[PDB]
Amino acid sequence: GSSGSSGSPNPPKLTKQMNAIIDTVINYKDSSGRQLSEVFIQLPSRKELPEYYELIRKPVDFKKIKERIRNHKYRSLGDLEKDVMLLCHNAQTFNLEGSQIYEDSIVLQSVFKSARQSGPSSG
């Protein structure tokens, strides 16, 4: 099973870490201005595109991932990875390979990992 009440609110050292990563991933750009996270901001409704929810297991978005950090939901950094990686995979599953949205997914990932290290942390 799993347990861990949300007694005290995550510290500034942890919360910040989460933000840094994402804040960088979502802000990360590839084209000459055309961001990628754009197509990863909001998702299609269940009525318009239901099939999406049929194949996709957990169609999560970015607005939700962030809403959690501010909701003291995520217990540890790992949790963030579970979603972040999910929000990406979901795409590679829907969007064809070597496609426009595809490549992006792969990129966002490379940025996520790097972020963890390359951040505001300045000894």
Side-chain angles (χ1 to χ4, degrees), residues 81-92:
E81 179 183 55
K82 306 270 90 90
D83 276 42
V84 176
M85 300 300 103
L86 204 293
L87 160 155
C88 271
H89 177 107
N90 282 339
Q92 279 196 18

Side-chain angles (χ1 to χ4, degrees), residues 1-10 71-76 79:
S2 60
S3 275
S5 308
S6 58
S8 279
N10 315 355
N71 282 343
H72 304 283
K73 288 270 69 270
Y74 294 137
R75 282 279 275 197
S76 194
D79 304 74

